[PDB]
From a paper:
Antibody 10E8 is one of the broadest monoclonal antibodies thus far identified that effectively neutralizes diverse strains of HIV-1. It targets the membrane-proximal external region (MPER) of the HIV-1 viral spike with a highly hydrophobic antigen-binding region. Here we show cis-trans conformational isomerization of the Tyr-Pro-Pro (YPP) motif in the heavy chain 3rd complementarity-determining region (CDR H3) of antibody 10E8 to be the mechanistic basis of its multipeak behavior. Overall, our results show how a conformationally dynamic cis-proline and the interaction between the CDR H3 and the CDR L1 of 10E8 appear to provide exactly the requisite degree of structural plasticity needed for a highly hydrophobic surface to recognize an MPER epitope.
Residue numbers in the entry:
A (entry chain L): 2 to 9, 11 to 95, 95A, 95B, 95C, 96 to 209
B (entry chain H): 1 to 52, 52A, 52B, 52C, 53 to 82, 82A, 82B, 82C, ...
Amino acid sequence: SELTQDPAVSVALKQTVTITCRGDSLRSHYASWYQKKPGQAPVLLFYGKNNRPSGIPDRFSGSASGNRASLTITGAQAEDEADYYCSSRDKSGSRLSVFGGGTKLTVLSQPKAAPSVTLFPPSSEELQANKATLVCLISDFYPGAVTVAWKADSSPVKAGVETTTPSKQSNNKYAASSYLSLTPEQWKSHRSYSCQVTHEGSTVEKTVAP
Amino acid sequence: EVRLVESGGGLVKPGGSLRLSCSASGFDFDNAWMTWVRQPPGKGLEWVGRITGPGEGWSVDYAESVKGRFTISRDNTKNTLYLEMNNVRTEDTGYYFCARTGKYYDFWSGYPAGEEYFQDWGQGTLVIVSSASTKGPSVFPLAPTAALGCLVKDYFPEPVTVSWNSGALTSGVHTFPAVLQSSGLYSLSSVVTVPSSSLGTQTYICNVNHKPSNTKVDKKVEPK
């Protein structure tokens, strides 16, 4: 929090990427760096001026200048896709520690693929249960990042939207889902609703009508 | 060799209390500095606090977010670190990790400048702070190659398990991570892509199990 990191970076398979952490406390303290994957504990990658723990591949290295500390991954492998966190003192001389906000590293390991999008209207069973949920299913895209926007008729819809972070499919492409929760009256009160999925600067849209 | 195992996680209501424990082996626990780190689901790591060794008199430091509510203690005889969580809030969810903490300093730099790093970590124990009550999901069909699915809606707590055709259908099946809605209840969906020629001909049933509520639902998903 006194340590700032960019939320997301991409690197081509086998190439090199630098993740940066910035804070006033880095002017007098070194940072340590952690890798975090879902379902697994964080792992220490690098610490101090020039220390890489045993067991960590030598493609991970750390550097520091001024208010900045940097983790460089030379020759990124697919297994390096993960969140990376820096940690240091929250301020010079402090007894406390803090983590940066994390950087999600995407390792681009297969060609771009545009999302297929399916939009399900509320089922009659859900309507009878006095609820109305539209389900936007987003599948078969790479890399695994999308933005979802919803429209009621032609107006952007704000409240009632929940969207999952993209999850890997068995074909190694990604899927995501987005939900628009409405009351039956709200559902029946518009001519149409639209799910708009933007992926790498291109938008795919599907529309349903009650 | 080095082993760290956290335990004590579970469900607690806002304002409640809970004690986490971390059992350690494979290292000199008595001199080890030990740190608690937490990660809310879908969010970053947060330093909670650290307990020092004998040289610093078992001194404890805490993040401002938890100071006055959380207490860190250790029992060297049991090689165990504790986190006493009191007056918990929703923001205290969820995974709590114990980490053996190293110290680094440049010896002859001449500027006082020590820092700590987290060299060994346990797998974490999940704490859910929520006012919600146990509730089984409603299962609704997502009617239709073609995609069909089931919407598993408004359940608490996690997890639910979803299979298709009693587990005989796994290829083409994708079950999404749950979303936590503003109501405090979770919802998820499971989808399967099937041949178009099979829509009204082969039966597709999603089997939903929610153990906390002893809910077992089988929903046939048919074309409209």
